């Protein structure tokens, strides 16, 4: 049934049968992932911007991002003038790819932006990646450290003066997914569902909705604040979010997971950016990123849905009653 028919003790069970994705073709296709890394790390631009690394983004036939980062960049801006020119050099390397290399799955790179699809026959799946050429601003991360704010002092630079704060969020994508892979399952299925719910909510807006990434983050927010444990109520999870939602024009929410207010560049962009008018989602991957920020009236559409959503079977027990949304602090 849809998950607008789902009530709250079905929504388990609803994130199993429709959800989950299927393991074996996940696994395929990080294998095939790994496989185009190596191949365009070693094969672009063989001939100073260079492909250091692969990997994958936000994820909805399911849709993901596929950043395809460059060094070597004078700017990040230039991600975005040469991008043309990143683009035809990377598609021509997916091709090779495509025509060298064997994968477990079907590989096609999309005809004339630019995408290739990852299907399996045997499965009934697909995943279609949209290719983001990226300046490689960490160069060498690894998780458990922050990026050295330096980095984020030359971003927050750029972004000032070109007036594109946020608009670089790309480059930190590895910061982005780590976020959101260091999670509990149950909460990693909570956020399933959740994008679910959103994109449902997509389906019927003619105008725009918060980005995905927000409510993602939102997600964490809610169980970081009203749960922080490994098992809990799936349905009671789900309708603090629809309730968090209604409150986006109180919301001031960041993290200090990869950056913090020790630099005064970063501390300043931080600052500036919580005094914007809410709802402020601070990107705990970019300093200069308000997800889903400067436009309150996209808020709007979301928290009515939110409303509808919270009169829905999704959060209610047999009797009508709400299963009730996690107490907060």
Same mark, same amino acid.
């Given at each position: 049934?849809?998950?607008?028919?789902?009530?709250?003790?079905?929504?388990?069970?609803?994130?199993?049968?429709? +959800?989950?994705?299927?393991?074996?073709?996940?696994?395929?296709?990080?294998?095939?992932?790994?496989?185009?890394?190596?191949?365009?790390?070693?094969?672009?631009?063989?001939?100073?911007?260079?492909?250091?690394?692969?990997?994958?983004?936000?994820?909805?036939? *399911?849709?993901?991002?596929?950043?395809?980062?460059?060094?070597?960049?004078?700017?990040?801006?230039?991600?975005?003038?040469?991008?043309?020119?990143?683009? &035809?050099?990377?598609?021509?390397?997916?091709?090779?790819?495509?025509?060298?290399?064997?994968?477990?799955?079907?590989?096609?790179?999309?005809?004339?932006?630019?995408?290739?699809?990852?299907?399996?026959?045997?499965?009934?799946?697909?995943?279609?990646?949209?290719?983001?050429?990226?300046?490689?601003?960490?160069?060498? /991360?690894?998780?458990?450290?922050?990026?050295?704010?330096?980095?984020?002092?030359?971003?927050?630079?750029?972004?000032?003066?070109?007036?594109?704060?946020?608009?670089? *969020?790309?480059?930190?994508?590895?910061?982005?997914?780590?976020?959101?892979?260091?999670?509990?399952?149950?909460?990693?299925?909570?956020?399933?569902?959740?994008?679910?719910?959103?994109?449902?909510?997509?389906?019927?807006?003619?105008?725009?909705?918060?980005?995905?990434?927000?409510?993602?983050?939102?997600?964490?927010?809610?169980?970081? &604040?009203?749960?922080?444990?490994?098992?809990?109520?799936?349905?009671?999870?789900?309708?603090?979010?629809?309730?968090?939602?209604?409150?986006?024009?109180?919301?001031?929410?960041?993290?200090?997971?990869?950056?913090?207010?020790?630099?005064?560049?970063?501390?300043?962009?931080?600052?500036?950016?919580?005094?914007?008018?809410?709802?402020?989602?601070?990107?705990?991957?970019?300093?200069?990123?308000?997800?889903?920020?400067?436009?309150?009236? *996209?808020?709007?559409?979301?928290?009515?849905?939110?409303?509808? /959503?919270?009169?829905?079977?999704?959060?209610?027990?047999?009797?009508? *009653?709400?299963?009730?949304?996690?107490?907060? +602090?």
């Amino acid at each position: 049934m849809e998950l607008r028919h789902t009530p709250a003790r079905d929504l388990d069970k609803f994130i199993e049968d429709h +959800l989950l994705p299927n393991t074996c073709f996940r696994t395929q296709v990080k294998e095939a992932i790994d496989i185009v890394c190596r191949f365009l790390k070693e094969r672009c631009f063989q001939g100073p911007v260079r492909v250091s690394k692969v990997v994958k983004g936000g994820s909805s036939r *399911s849709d993901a991002d596929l950043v395809v980062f460059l060094t070597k960049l004078t700017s990040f801006e230039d991600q975005l003038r040469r991008r043309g020119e990143f683009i &035809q050099e990377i598609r021509r390397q997916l091709e090779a790819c495509q025509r060298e290399q064997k994968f477990k799955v079907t590989f096609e790179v999309q005809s004339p932006a630019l995408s290739f699809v990852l299907s399996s026959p045997q499965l009934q799946q697909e995943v279609e990646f949209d290719v983001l050429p990226a300046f490689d601003a960490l160069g060498q /991360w690894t998780p458990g450290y922050k990026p050295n704010p330096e980095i984020y002092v030359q971003l927050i630079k750029e972004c000032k003066s070109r007036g594109k704060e946020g608009e670089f *969020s790309t480059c930190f994508t590895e910061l982005q997914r780590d976020f959101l892979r260091n999670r509990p399952t149950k909460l990693k299925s909570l956020i399933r569902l959740v994008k679910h719910w959103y994109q449902t909510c997509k389906k019927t807006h003619g105008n725009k909705l918060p980005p995905q990434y927000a409510l993602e983050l939102l997600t964490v927010y809610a169980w970081e &604040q009203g749960s922080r444990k490994t098992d809990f109520s799936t349905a009671q999870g789900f309708q603090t979010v629809l309730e968090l939602v209604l409150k986006h024009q109180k919301l001031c929410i960041f993290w200090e997971a990869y950056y913090d207010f020790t630099n005064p560049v970063v501390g300043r962009c931080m600052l500036q950016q919580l005094k914007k008018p809410r709802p402020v989602i601070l990107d705990p991957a970019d300093p200069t990123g308000n997800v889903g920020g400067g436009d309150t009236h *996209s808020w709007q559409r979301l928290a009515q849905e939110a409303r509808v /959503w919270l009169g829905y079977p999704c959060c209610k027990n047999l009797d009508g *009653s709400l299963v009730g949304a996690w107490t907060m +602090l």
